[PDB]
Design a protein around this ligand. Sequence first.
Ligand SMILES: C#CCO[C@@H]1[C@@H](C)[C@H](OC(=O)NCCCNC(=N)NC(=O)NC)[C@@H](C)C(=O)O[C@H](CC)[C@@](C)(O)[C@H](O)[C@@H](C)[C@@H](O)[C@H](C)C[C@@]1(C)O
Ligand SMILES: [Cl-]
Length: 498
Amino acid sequence: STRKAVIGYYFIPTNQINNYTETDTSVVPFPVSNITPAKAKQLTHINFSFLDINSNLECAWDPATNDAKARDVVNRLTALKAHNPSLRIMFSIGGWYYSNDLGVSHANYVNAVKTPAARTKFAQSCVRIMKDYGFDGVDIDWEYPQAAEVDGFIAALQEIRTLLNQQTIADGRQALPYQLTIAGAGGAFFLSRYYSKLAQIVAPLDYINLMTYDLAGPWEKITNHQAALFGDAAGPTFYNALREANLGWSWEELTRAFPSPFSLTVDAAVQQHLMMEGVPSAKIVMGVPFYGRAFKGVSGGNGGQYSSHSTPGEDPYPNADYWLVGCDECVRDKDPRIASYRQLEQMLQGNYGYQRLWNDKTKTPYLYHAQNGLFVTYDDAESFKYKAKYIKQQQLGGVMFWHLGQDNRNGDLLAALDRYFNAADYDDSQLDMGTGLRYTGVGPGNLPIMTAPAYVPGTTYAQGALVSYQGYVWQTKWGYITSAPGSDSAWLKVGRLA
Ligand SMILES: C#CCO[C@@H]1[C@@H](C)[C@H](OC(=O)NCCCNC(=N)NC(=O)NC)[C@@H](C)C(=O)O[C@H](CC)[C@@](C)(O)[C@H](O)[C@@H](C)[C@@H](O)[C@H](C)C[C@@]1(C)O
Ligand SMILES: [Cl-]
């Protein structure tokens, strides 16, 4: 009976705000009016993006922004709520450009959360901006706080939470309370920056929206799927950085939670969150891309998958060779490395030389261009069936996506997600989830239900013996043990009872 969240980013850059129009897609390709009533109903959240933190260490619009045009654009979004009383228009602070380790505003994020007075000033600025512009909540997309900054970041979420809760009371908004989310890492390497303190990060949130995409890109040696649901044994594997996090666990605890190497998948990230105690499945939201990542210079044989490649990683894109055949948006944006789903439909439909292929382990599509040596990893309405089924099975909070302007005109990706969660006549009970590699880590937060004979005092237990005691199932790490389970370092808690 609890509706899955469906959280869609709406991005619009300052120049497009300042020149805003709904009737000239060469100035504003994706005006608010493209979000029809039918789409408004299919969404639960729209994250307006991006705001920033300025050098006064406050939430702020880009200072080049025209305030009147900004208010007008935001009002058009909040008008959508007339079609859907569940809808929230969040705003989002950060993004890669502002907040990455070398981003233009990076130090402001670091400083804004550093001290108690700075957090007070920052937190207040967030809720003031929310109220002043009519937003329904605050999303933080800082990519990413490093381990040293993480206590500040946590305290800043806690302080924003408290102020949001005051505001909910003031405005009598218990029916649609003001919400706090973050865009959280969706792969272990960035996740490791705050993993040890995950429960504290998630506690003040309504959701943590996992960025379980961009798991592959020009920075890797080898082409791969950017958002594989499950692992492909033929694909690359990675060092599990989480095993080096400051957790204080034992060798066995670490080994049983963090297999390494591992397959960098959506399912990995979700399980890595669930493993942690105090991180509930209902607060975890699976991110999906509405775009593809394109690679050139690939070799044939396996559809361009798991190939070396010659895709430039530099920013800005280093020349005017827009080699992604058929991609008109790429020419407009001067970058061939990203293509919207909208665009990819057109590329596949025209005579551009792509095949659409399907990897039945990862449960994701990909384009291959055999003649030129191109590979594109993306998501579509089919991959979303498996991802939606997984969402339901794991009792996650919902789905998030970047971004709305990349759906096709009819909004088929959004419609498909809404249908897989909510359509009375949609049935995925027979949908086969395949034999891709699952992430098998177990931690304190996701012990399976087990049974075993009750521990008996005086009994000598060999290595691997399983007993039950005080609510859990326990396993000896070596033999022979007679100590009560949990009373020393010889027992591993492996399961929970009854
Ligand atoms: C959050 C994300 C992605 O940001 C956008 C870039 C970084 C864009 O990055 C991507 O779209 N990545 C895929 C999504 C990855 N998502 C996230 N990291 N986070 C997320 O999804 N959060 C919810 C890159 C390629 C770019 O053009 O960069 C060019 C230069 C190469 C750049 C930085 O000049 C941009 O042109 C920017 C000037 C401008 O377009 C906006 C501000 C950035 C944007 C929206 O295009
Ligand atoms: Cl709610």
